[PDB]
Amino acid sequence: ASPFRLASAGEISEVQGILRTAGLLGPEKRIAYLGVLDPARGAGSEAEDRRFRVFIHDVSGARPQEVTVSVTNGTVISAVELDTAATGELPVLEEEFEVVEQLLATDERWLKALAARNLDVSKVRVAPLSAGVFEYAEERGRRILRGLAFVQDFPEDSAWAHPVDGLVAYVDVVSKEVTRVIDTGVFPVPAEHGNYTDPELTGPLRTTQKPISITQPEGPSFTVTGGNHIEWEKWSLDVGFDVREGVVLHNIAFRDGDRLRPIINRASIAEMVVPYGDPSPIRSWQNYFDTGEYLVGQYANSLELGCDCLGDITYLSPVISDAFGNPREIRNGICMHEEDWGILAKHSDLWSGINYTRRNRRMVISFFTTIGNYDYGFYWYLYLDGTIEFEAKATGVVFTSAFPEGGSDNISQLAPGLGAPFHQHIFSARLDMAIDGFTNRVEEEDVVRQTMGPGNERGNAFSRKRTVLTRESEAVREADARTGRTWIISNPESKNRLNEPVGYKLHAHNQPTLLADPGSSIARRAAFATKDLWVTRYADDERYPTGDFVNQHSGGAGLPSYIAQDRDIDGQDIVVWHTFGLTHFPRVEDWPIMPVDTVGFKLRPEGFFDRSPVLDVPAN
Amino acid sequence: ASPFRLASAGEISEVQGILRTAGLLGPEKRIAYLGVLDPARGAGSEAEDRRFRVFIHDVSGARPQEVTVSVTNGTVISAVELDTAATGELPVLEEEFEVVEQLLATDERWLKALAARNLDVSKVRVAPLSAGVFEYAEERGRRILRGLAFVQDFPEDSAWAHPVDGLVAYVDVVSKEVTRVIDTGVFPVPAEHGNYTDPELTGPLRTTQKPISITQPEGPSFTVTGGNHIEWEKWSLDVGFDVREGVVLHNIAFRDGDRLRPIINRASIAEMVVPYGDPSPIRSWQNYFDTGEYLVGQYANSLELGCDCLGDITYLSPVISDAFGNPREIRNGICMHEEDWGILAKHSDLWSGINYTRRNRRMVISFFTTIGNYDYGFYWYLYLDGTIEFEAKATGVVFTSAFPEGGSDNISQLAPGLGAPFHQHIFSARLDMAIDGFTNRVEEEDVVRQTMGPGNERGNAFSRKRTVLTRESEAVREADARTGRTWIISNPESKNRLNEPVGYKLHAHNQPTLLADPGSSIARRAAFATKDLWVTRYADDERYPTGDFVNQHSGGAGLPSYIAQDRDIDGQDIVVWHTFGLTHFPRVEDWPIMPVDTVGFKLRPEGFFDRSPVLDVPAN
Ligand SMILES: [Cu+2]
Ligand SMILES: [Cu+2]
Ligand code: NA
Ligand code: NA
């Protein structure tokens, strides 16, 4: 059995049984996170030990625990009681989504605010929102959620159309108390609906779209073995799934002749945060760590054939744990298919008379998740020519507010009285590199402009310079789009046939990084988001750029603390963390449901191969 | 008949007849460029006048002419004798491609250089390369080409594998004289072949690719009427074709309810240049204006069904003129099809219970051209949601040199002894804007970071600032990727239902612009390439950023001279010129034939619509 196989239902049940037998999973306990751990370096031969890590919440007020179990051996490896005021609260539990609204519905201050606005409490939905860390001392060590109100005129109404501005509440979800209700003033509740399946708003549906049929009459060119091992057009990898990160790729390698050459040991989106830029106190605290606080894998959609995934689709249905340790399958949660990708290479040569055209293809591994109003697709692509790409597709319904009478520098108007606060969606890709194996380094490569003069008399020359990042203290880097800045991951001990180090070049989109003031809470809690590229020395406990417990965790842990170790990264087992985000000034076209917009990055081979790796692609 | 229809064979013949009857097209004359002119502003009602512009070369040494004819009326509108030392030489003629090699084959200096290197003259191919303007006074007013030598070991060999470095020659293609032969020293001629259809180099061809079938059982959702008028998913446009620019898009508009709203009046790639960054005198003069010097439309490939264009394809076969004024069809030179484009919009709403998914599509209009060693695909995309995108796909065989013994700061190694000089491929997109009609302006929009303090106590706020470009003197702009800089084209007299000006936002890729020293010849001749964005007032004679006659034209004309008029662009008929390029440090994977790499830009509606324009898209 591959140590990188997906968790099975039975493994989850065994975790549940081990915890129960150990006294760690009584009736007051709730699992907030559960996932398999990756194999240790050098374990491959042989003795598998499948370990699972668990964060256990306690609804009676006792301290939560972090536990690692061996499902192979039926044992508890470690169990530690957590002090959440110090190391952070556990991820938000799905069962807490409804608690915020329920507690507020009987609170006299909340009821007073709603009555002043002539809103029926039974129609008022409350978004259960992560709290962060601000000035409220009573929240330290307590599990808090904040609530913003949205009116549903009827049960199938889009409540996002009807934000209740001027009002926010804070709730202790363990003691089941409402800590604060803040009402700064009434705002009109926007009147128009945003019901994008209502014929009155859509108009007559188009009849002009003729069908498109994508089929594979001999089936797909990729095979799946061992549950999640992919072989496709010389690529080899394993598709993992973690309730926090979502789809994870392991052991990305390329068969070059008859050697299996590693490229990336683990690829994931290790954090994704949505900071808001509206200074109103109703929302200025708002920063949604979709990955670290809510767990994006947990909310993966079941993807329907034809509608969500077009073509010849192979599905994985990953297993996660519910809050009690029972396995739950996410049916059709991962889509895998191969797609045509236009022209790969083409040349019509006058002198030889030979005309040559070849087509490209990509392997696609994706999932789609829903976090409140947001919906995101996470796509990994592998191309015939060795390129690796990630793309996020952001859609859903924009988070709304009132639109202030005199306008706003921090909010867009979408409809009469309806606003959408400015925000960013910022991702961290954690790429545990293995370029031709684990001995790797990173160089920053800039274009170099040259002055007209001796040695360059016509002023045409230009060049490039590479700077080796030798230690972690030197490996916090920013974009420089103007100088074409990229980062090359190479293996200094593996040379191609031209005696040059094999490598892969990371091409970033160079979008803005975190805009918040450097002194803000979010700049400290999401320090990773302030820089485009970080390199660390591999360490099995350094998994997320924000640390293990992001919820209400005050700042510092994660990448800035890892980097302080100032470890050697010059020909060592290293990890690249790439920050990339979308800055979203909402547009009217984003309302009532937003068209997809994208952000991502790609890596291309750079002297990894001895010549083009796609010379053996056939015509047709 | 639409005044924007493609030229017909008969129209070309009529130009030929008008010129002949006027005394302008005798036996010594050769047509270097011929194309229809666009209709004048306000002509639409009615009286069509189809005019064609012609550049006429004279092989006997007489001065060339620029002529405009009316094929409607059978008349010569204007005919002007050109002074090429002042205003530039005419575009390279296809018949001159072979002349450089032929003249050199009997030149004793060339023969001496080849004999020193033991090369058989019959095997030596000579790339016919544009000359530019450097220190050689005798070239002023003469039609010069420069030649670089490549060995073909046999007739179906790839000569690019065997550059002859240290050697360059200059030729007067009218007087049929060799002006200079420069031999700076022998370099080994690289020995390996680059024959990408040789089984010895490809290895056994893959058998792993299973078929992909893309079909449309009811045909495509777009119609073509009037030869080149497209209607597709609310878009309306006309597809033009010009021998210089290639595919051109006219009258891009969107049917919003029952109004046809204009967006872009004319879209084209109005220049594309390839500057080289190797300071060796063998190549330091090298700058290939594929569009302005060679005419990319002229060399458009015939695109084969299945191999070049996959799916349900509708072809246009544009007509151009040969050197004598006879019409010539480029069979299957333009591909049109619609393609699935993944998820358009999706949201799974907990509170309403409604799960909603819709798919996107794009209309694709493309051609592929071959310029010596280079092959480029030009793609225009129209999406359901109003987005417009351009993409260039660069492939072919890299231009080679020797790889110097001690290495090189300006050349990559590809194979033993084989180099590829650093270079850029830099495009200019000329977008004659018509956002809701012709009264337009441009704003530069930057993200604005805000300081923590009063009014922003938590340091989370961020904003945006828009700067109106009021006159052409203010409208030469550079990228600022770090501040998320974009440019919005709006109609200040057309408001959406929220009382905000309708607009489209240009999203650039923010790649490096021209790297050459500002004092270089190429910085002067390709001044457009030094800045990302220019805005001019529309003028029917301001067609190319480099001017009308680029070949051996010394500098200044084009955009820097247009801009000096300092015309009002604040709510006027304006033209956006976007510079965007690929900076190419060749990689071993680019050899022997290069995988496609891409560059481009896109424009998205920004308050153009009153809400999402794709609410009427049906499921499935
Ligand atoms: Cu957003
Ligand atoms: Cu190139
Ligand atoms: Na590593
Ligand atoms: Na215009």
Author numbering:
A (entry chain X), B (entry chain X): 9 to 628
Mind quoting what the paper says about this structure?
Recently, we succeeded in obtaining a neutron diffraction data set from a CAO crystal derived from Arthrobacter globiformis (AGAO) at a resolution of 1.72 Å, which is unprecedentedly high for a protein containing over 400 residues. Moreover, we performed joint refinement using moderate-resolution X-ray data (1.72 Å) to evaluate the significance of using high-resolution X-ray diffraction data. In the active-site structure determined by neutron analysis, the cofactor TPQ and the prosthetic copper ion coordinated by three His residues (His431, His433 and His592) and two water molecules in distorted pyramidal geometry were located at essentially the same positions as those found in the X-ray/neutron analysis. The previous joint-refined structure revealed that TPQ adopts an equilibrium state between the keto and enolate forms, based on the nonplanar model of the quinone ring obtained from the atomic resolution X-ray diffraction data and on the shape of the SLD map at the C3 position of TPQ [Figs. 2(a) and 2(b)]. However, even if the low completeness is overcome, joint refinement with high-resolution X-ray data provides more accurate heavy-atom coordinates, which in turn could improve the SLD for H/D atoms.
Copper amine oxidases (CAOs) occur widely in biological species ranging from bacteria to plants and animals, and catalyse the oxidative deamination of various primary amines to produce the corresponding aldehydes, hydrogen peroxide and ammonia. The CAO family commonly has a homodimeric subunit structure with a prosthetic Cu2+ ion and a protein-derived quinone cofactor, topaquinone (2,4,5-trihydroxyphenylalanine quinone; TPQ), in the active site of each subunit. The organic redox cofactor TPQ is post-translationally synthesized from a specific tyrosine residue encoded in the polypeptide chain of all CAOs. After single-turnover biogenesis of TPQ, the mature enzyme can then catalyse the multi-turnover amine-oxidation reaction.
